[PDB]
Ligand binder design. Structure first.
Ligand SMILES: C=CC(=O)N1CCC[C@@H](n2nc(-c3ccc(Oc4ccccc4)cc3)c3c(N)ncnc32)C1
Length: 258
C-alpha cells in the first residue's frame, strides 16, 4: 500500500500541532487529501504495522485511507469538501443548521464509532476537529489510529490512569454532542484544562445547552457516567439518535437556533 513520494500537493488546507494536511492529486486525476506528519514520533516501523487502519476499517462514516508512504509521511485519504465539522459549525453554515441536521450528523458519527466498536478497536481522540464533513451533511470520522492534549474531551479514566477504552470514546462523544448543540463552542466554557479535572472528579457535568431538549442532555450524562462500563453502547447511541424525532421528541418544533 506504499507508493513513493512523487505525487505532489497543491493547496494546503491547514496546519495543526502534529504535521500538515494538504489538498492534492494522485495518479494525475484522483482528487485526494494528503495528511503530512512531520518528524514528531514517526514510527516508520510501528506506523506500518498500522495495517488495521486500512484493513476492515472501511466504513461509510470512516475516512477511507488510500495509501501511506513508509521520513515524514503523507497519509493519503479521500477529500472531504466542507472540511472539519468544527469549522462547518463555526462557519457560515451554522446559521441555518438546526437540531434535525445536528442529530443526523451525530447519528452518523455514532454509526462509524459503532463500527470501530464492533471491530473491538479504540479511537483515542474523538472530537469535532477529527470529523470531516462532505456535501449533503455526510460526516466521517478521521484520525483514529494515533498512539505514541484535549483534556476537555478525554474521559477521566483515561486522563489520570491511562485507561483508554471504547467507553472512553463514548465520554468524548458526549462532549462532542455539546459541540454540535453549541455550534462549535469550546466545552466547559470559562474553565482551564486543570480546573476541569478538579470539577469532573467532584461531580461537575456541563449543563443543558440553550434551546437543547433535556432528552439530548440526558444522553450526554449517560455518556458522562463515572463508571465506564455503565456508559451506553455506540449501538445504543446510533439507534437513539436515528429514532430521536419519533420515539423521544415527537413534539419538537424548530426554534431560532436549534
Ligand atoms: C481548516 C479546517 C479544516 O477543515 N481542517 C483543518 C486542517 C486539516 C483539514 N483536513 N485534514 C484531513 C485529513 C486527511 C487525511 C487524514 O488521514 C487520516 C488520519 C487519521 C485517520 C483517518 C485519516 C487525516 C486528516 C482532511 C480531509 N479529508 N478533508 C478535508 N480537510 C482535512 C481539516
Amino acid at each position: 500500500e506504499i507508493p513513493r513520494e512523487s505525487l505532489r500537493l497543491e493547496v494546503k488546507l491547514g496546519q495543526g500541532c502534529f504535521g500538515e494536511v494538504w489538498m492534492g492529486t494522485w495518479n494525475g486525476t484522483t482528487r485526494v487529501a494528503i495528511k503530512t506528519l512531520k518528524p514528531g514520533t514517526m514510527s516508520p516501523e510501528a506506523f506500518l504495522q498500522e495495517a488495521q487502519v486500512m484493513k476492515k476499517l472501511r466504513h461509510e462514516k470512516l475516512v477511507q485511507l488510500y495509501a501511506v508512504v513508509s521520513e515524514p509521511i503523507y497519509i493519503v485519504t479521500e477529500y472531504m469538501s466542507k472540511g472539519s465539522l468544527l469549522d462547518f459549525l463555526k462557519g457560515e453554515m451554522g446559521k441555518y443548521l438546526r437540531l434535525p441536521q445536528l442529530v443526523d450528523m451525530a447519528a452518523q458519527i455514532a454509526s462509524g464509532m459503532a463500527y470501530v466498536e464492533r471491530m473491538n478497536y479504540v479511537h483515542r481522540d474523538l472530537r469535532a476537529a477529527n470529523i470531516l464533513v462532505g456535501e449533503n451533511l455526510v460526516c466521517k470520522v478521521a484520525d483514529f489510529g494515533l498512539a505514541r492534549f484535549p483534556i476537555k474531551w478525554t474521559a477521566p479514566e483515561a486522563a489520570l490512569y491511562g485507561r483508554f477504552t471504547i467507553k472512553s470514546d463514548v465520554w468524548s462523544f458526549g462532549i462532542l454532542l455539546t459541540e454540535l448543540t453549541t455550534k462549535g463552542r469550546v466545552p466547559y466554557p470559562g474553565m482551564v484544562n486543570r480546573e476541569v479535572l478538579d470539577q469532573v472528579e467532584r461531580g461537575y457535568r456541563m449543563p443543558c445547552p440553550p434551546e437543547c431538549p433535556e432528552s439530548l442532555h440526558d444522553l450526554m450524562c449517560q455518556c458522562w457516567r463515572k463508571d465506564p462500563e455503565e456508559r451506553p453502547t455506540f449501538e445504543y447511541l446510533q439507534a437513539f439518535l436515528e429514532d430521536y424525532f419519533t420515539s423521544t421528541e415527537p413534539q419538537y418544533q424548530p426554534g431560532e437556533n436549534l
